Amino acid sequence: DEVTPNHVAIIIDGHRKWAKSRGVTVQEGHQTGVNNWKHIISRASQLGIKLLTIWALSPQNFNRSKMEVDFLMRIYEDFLRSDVKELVTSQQDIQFSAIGDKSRLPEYLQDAISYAEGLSQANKGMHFILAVAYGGREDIVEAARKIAAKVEHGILRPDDIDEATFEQHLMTNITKFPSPDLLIRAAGEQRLSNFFLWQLPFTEFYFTPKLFPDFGEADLLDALASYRCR
Amino acid sequence: DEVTPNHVAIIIDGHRKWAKSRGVTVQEGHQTGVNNWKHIISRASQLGIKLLTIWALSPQNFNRSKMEVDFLMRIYEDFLRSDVKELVTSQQDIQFSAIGDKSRLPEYLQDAISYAEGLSQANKGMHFILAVAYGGREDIVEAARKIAAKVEHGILRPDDIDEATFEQHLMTNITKFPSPDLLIRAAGEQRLSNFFLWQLPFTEFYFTPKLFPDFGEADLLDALASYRCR
Prior knowledge:
230 residues; alpha/beta; Undecaprenyl pyrophosphate synthetase; 6-stranded parallel sheet; globular
């Protein structure tokens, strides 16, 4: 069917709030959040979505405490070594990529990343993108930098720059569905917090108050039913 | 106070729907919409907002019927010759600019535009921007084109490109508040429809079901009270 979005993107949020409300640590809030991901991914795959993006970490998130960030990077490595392995080797045959500024991540996380990308490189199922150390402004700036370098080496002239060319130098140039059809944001806030910007001119937004550690397959289903009503 | 946004931007929508529901023409829907603007602007000025942007016309809107568009361009000229004149000459001392691709507009509208900009050029009150034939993707592309031209003439090197430099070549480079603090969208839809993109990484979104011809000063007040609660 076509009333199923090709690209669904998710802003996760609410881990601290949820931890707080449950008299629990933020590390446990984060871990339970991340444990939801595999079911979210399988479900998106089952629904015939071609691309699911989960926004795991912004470049501003590097401003949180070092303990918090280091815990997160570890949880992400566990996710890639455990759950992603299963997803990409299962009959869902998911293809895995990460986007963002990877050289800002610890080398252990960079290696879990390229391992899962290598493992799934020729799979044919749903694309799953983990956006880590990704920010929308930075993506646009880096695209413009790359284009500028090519202009300086004679490869491109200023008036050859159009949307399509701009689109080919964004970090989303790994997909043919760069622009999400549907953007979901958990935890109640109605803003982008420097996620995709270029990619969002026509995307439908869906805001739930649900804190992300409580966010399940049903909530993805609810986002999709909202999308179908529009 | 500081819990009052510096920049408020408005996506207007619902004119056809409203016309329809009232057994009336779209031209009358549009005209009643535009008549709301002056009260919206005075009120924003009274509230101490430093910049109010109204998104009057996208480059995609050029796809509607020629009669519809021509009527709109006329209504906009009437607005600039009538209401804006009053706003900029009153004690609110509003400064007027338009942004967007102006050379796509009829010459009569371009002239009403530069007349109101000349008339208000040295006013010191709230900035009012009318975004006409403006689109967020196009703004970013044009910024990148300009930067690219400067790279080709030796004026700039690729690694000199950063947010700040990118920001200076956007159509919003006429303000020091390019990024809206609060984005309001009438008529129920939850998406940007190719309005600002670069400018929105942290802006708060506020969606009302109110059709824009019914949108008044109270609705701006409601958007501001939402913003203060966040």
